[PDB]
Design a protein around this ligand. Sequence first.
Ligand SMILES: *[C@@H]1O[C@H](CO)[C@@H](O[C@@H]2O[C@H](CO)[C@@H](O[C@@H]3O[C@H](CO)[C@@H](O)[C@H](O)[C@@H]3O)[C@H](O)[C@H]2NC(C)=O)[C@H](O)[C@H]1NC(C)=O
Ligand SMILES: *[C@@H]1O[C@H](CO)[C@@H](O[C@@H]2O[C@H](CO)[C@@H](O[C@@H]3O[C@H](CO)[C@@H](O)[C@H](O)[C@@H]3O)[C@H](O)[C@H]2NC(C)=O)[C@H](O)[C@H]1NC(C)=O
Ligand SMILES: O=c1ccn([C@@H]2O[C@H](COP(=O)(O)OP(=O)(O)O)[C@@H](O)[C@H]2O)c(=O)[nH]1
Ligand SMILES: O=c1ccn([C@@H]2O[C@H](COP(=O)(O)OP(=O)(O)O)[C@@H](O)[C@H]2O)c(=O)[nH]1
Ligand SMILES: *[C@@H]1O[C@H](CO)[C@@H](O)[C@H](O)[C@H]1NC(C)=O
Ligand SMILES: *[C@@H]1O[C@H](CO)[C@@H](O)[C@H](O)[C@H]1NC(C)=O
Ligand SMILES: [Mg+2]
Ligand SMILES: [Mg+2]
Lengths: 321, 327
Amino acid sequence: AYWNREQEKLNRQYNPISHLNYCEPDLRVTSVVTGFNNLPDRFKDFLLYLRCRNYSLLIDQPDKCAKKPFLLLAIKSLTPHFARRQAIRESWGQESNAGNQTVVRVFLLGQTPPEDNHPDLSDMLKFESEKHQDILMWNYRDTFFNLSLKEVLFLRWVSTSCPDTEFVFKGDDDVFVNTHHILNYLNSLSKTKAKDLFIGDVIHNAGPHRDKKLKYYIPEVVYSGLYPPYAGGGGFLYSGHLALRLYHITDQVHLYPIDDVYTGMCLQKLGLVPEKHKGFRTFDIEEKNKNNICSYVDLMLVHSRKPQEMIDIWSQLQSAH
Amino acid sequence: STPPEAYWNREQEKLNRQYNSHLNYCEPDLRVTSVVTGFNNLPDRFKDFLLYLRCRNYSLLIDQPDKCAKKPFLLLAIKSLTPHFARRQAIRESWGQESNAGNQTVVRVFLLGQTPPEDNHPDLSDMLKFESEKHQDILMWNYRDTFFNLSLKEVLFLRWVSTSCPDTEFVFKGDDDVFVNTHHILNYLNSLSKTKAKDLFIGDVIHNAGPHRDKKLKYYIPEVVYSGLYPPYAGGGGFLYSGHLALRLYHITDQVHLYPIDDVYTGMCLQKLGLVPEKHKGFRTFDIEEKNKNNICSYVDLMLVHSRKPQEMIDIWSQLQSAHLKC
Ligand SMILES: *[C@@H]1O[C@H](CO)[C@@H](O[C@@H]2O[C@H](CO)[C@@H](O[C@@H]3O[C@H](CO)[C@@H](O)[C@H](O)[C@@H]3O)[C@H](O)[C@H]2NC(C)=O)[C@H](O)[C@H]1NC(C)=O
Ligand SMILES: *[C@@H]1O[C@H](CO)[C@@H](O[C@@H]2O[C@H](CO)[C@@H](O[C@@H]3O[C@H](CO)[C@@H](O)[C@H](O)[C@@H]3O)[C@H](O)[C@H]2NC(C)=O)[C@H](O)[C@H]1NC(C)=O
Ligand SMILES: O=c1ccn([C@@H]2O[C@H](COP(=O)(O)OP(=O)(O)O)[C@@H](O)[C@H]2O)c(=O)[nH]1
Ligand SMILES: O=c1ccn([C@@H]2O[C@H](COP(=O)(O)OP(=O)(O)O)[C@@H](O)[C@H]2O)c(=O)[nH]1
Ligand SMILES: *[C@@H]1O[C@H](CO)[C@@H](O)[C@H](O)[C@H]1NC(C)=O
Ligand SMILES: *[C@@H]1O[C@H](CO)[C@@H](O)[C@H](O)[C@H]1NC(C)=O
Ligand SMILES: [Mg+2]
Ligand SMILES: [Mg+2]
């Protein structure tokens, strides 16, 4: 498989044409990937531009972490998702300073360019960024298969602009997160379990989906074998110290079309295994418990909820029993 | 003794006898708790619909008073909710663009109410005000924007046509999740006789419909609320009518009680005018066949298709501009 063979080459370089800033189309893939011409467009773009990751930040918040945070909330989003971001601001993503444990929030965006037929929402996004001061936007095409790029550029921003946050929560903009429970959990940790914390909805021994109709389909010609253990499904929680170690190792791992698999590949290279926490309810909760606020007291996150549902749950949680 | 009709029917019978306050009484009408059988067991949307039925004098908070300074040929009026920024912007850029080919002016408004914090809506109100200042195409009224208040959205829009755009030749009223082939609409309007034009009303018209009685369905209506059948009505995403008829509809709205389903209410008003809306097969409110969805020639001969995402509307519109070369 192509990714496996290219990654083996990387392994030989680090453990005896750039893979990091070559940003012309890599036309060699049209010769060496069998059946390249019949691959879906997302795979063609992924393969042609694999070796380019030096994209610039167009909208930054460089002093976001001027007061060293206890918890950084970093939420993946797309330009048009205004209601999702605003509901997060008002509910579980509120910034705070309780107990002098500061919580800060950023949203992680790429471009939604006109060539992909996106409406031009640059005026609204600028208004939102000036009002709320929490948008980070980079100059790459925001797509599902560039989410591992979103991951690497975010880790690069943690390294440059938020290196001292004690913990990081990285998650999606359609999950409900019980941030109080997350904070209670983090404050229970020993110094030892904290320095390399990485928890979430972790699966072992998964492999690529081979059914061409599935969202996470990966052809055999792109990747072979099984996936490393990885946390997926909507969000995960880890230490800022480990964030720096993860950023440093990203140069040694080729980007991958599925972001959460990529993060698992970086952890494996560090010799770490992410740990499952049952409070990450990435397949929702039982239908019978969905209208009982007590079901939300004992979890970390649940996928998926609409903007109004996030605000409704958060408001009810504040008076739970 | 013949069985009593449902609550809506009995109030409409009263209205009919008065014409042959129900308009600005805005306290809760507590009489409904006594006369609507099983009121206490109704879903909340019905309780609110019934308690505030007699109130329709809500203020315009964001207006575009000069929208029709030049008498339009076609007014595009698109129902939307505050958070739908991407839908509105895709419509502006594609099929809802304002234009003036052949001096037949096309102008656009989006029709909004409030999305208040009490309904757990995120606060996007400052953004909306900025959007209105940038694009000058938002009409916003001070009422709670909900599915069961869409007939209120209809009446307040028709009131605005009467006060602020009474001379538009035609009106298209539609949803913000449809693709509209506005070029085909303009050619259709330019094909009409003077007489067919004065009372044009076309869309995806259903005859012989009645209220859905299954409590799990979106358009469920209890038997204690409405009894009997629906008049013919155009539904499904948009419909097209003359500005002259728009004024006749506005006048008759005082004579028809509001109704939880906006397109049925419009059908009720047309019936009271003695008109029957006409089906046009180009209103593809259940979409087109899967095998045709990626052939731009399928969009050339339709009026509208439900439903399309913002990126899909822009893609279709872009390809449509050169479809004459392939179709
Ligand atoms: C991930 O994001 C990157 C950066 O935005 C995307 O790279 C860009 O991809 C487009 C093609 O989709 C490239 O445009 C094409 O360039 C060729 C060669 O000059 C030109 O002939 C085509 O007409 C078209 O303009 C663009 O150069 C490239 N930009 C870079 C590398 O900076 C990439 O597509 C995204 N990947 C995925 C999986 O979405
Ligand atoms: C359609 O829009 C109207 C106008 O916004 C909505 O009327 C408003 O409905 C709410 C209840 O949902 C009323 O608030 C309630 O008032 C009572 C006392 O008056 C109070 O005890 C409740 O706690 C709550 O505050 C509000 O007064 C009423 N406003 C007006 C101007 O009539 C109506 O609910 C919407 N209808 C539907 C079907 O959504
Ligand atoms: O091009 C993209 C597609 C998705 N997302 C974000 O990625 C997350 C997961 O998207 P989705 O819910 O569609 O994935 P799923 O839960 O189906 O795996 C959400 O925060 C989306 O806003 C993104 O940032 N860029
Ligand atoms: O409270 C509401 C709910 C919906 N809509 C608009 O009503 C139209 C139809 O909504 P929907 O697509 O959900 O209805 P359906 O196609 O299922 O009948 C769309 O323009 C929505 O933006 C609205 O203006 N206010
Ligand atoms: C990355 O670096 C290369 C070489 O310095 C440069 O040519 C390219 O433009 C950069 N890519 C981007 C997207 O900035
Ligand atoms: C409608 O008019 C009545 C009486 O003039 C007034 O009491 C009421 O507040 C008005 N309704 C609204 C929503 O402004
Ligand atoms: Mg999701
Ligand atoms: Mg619809």
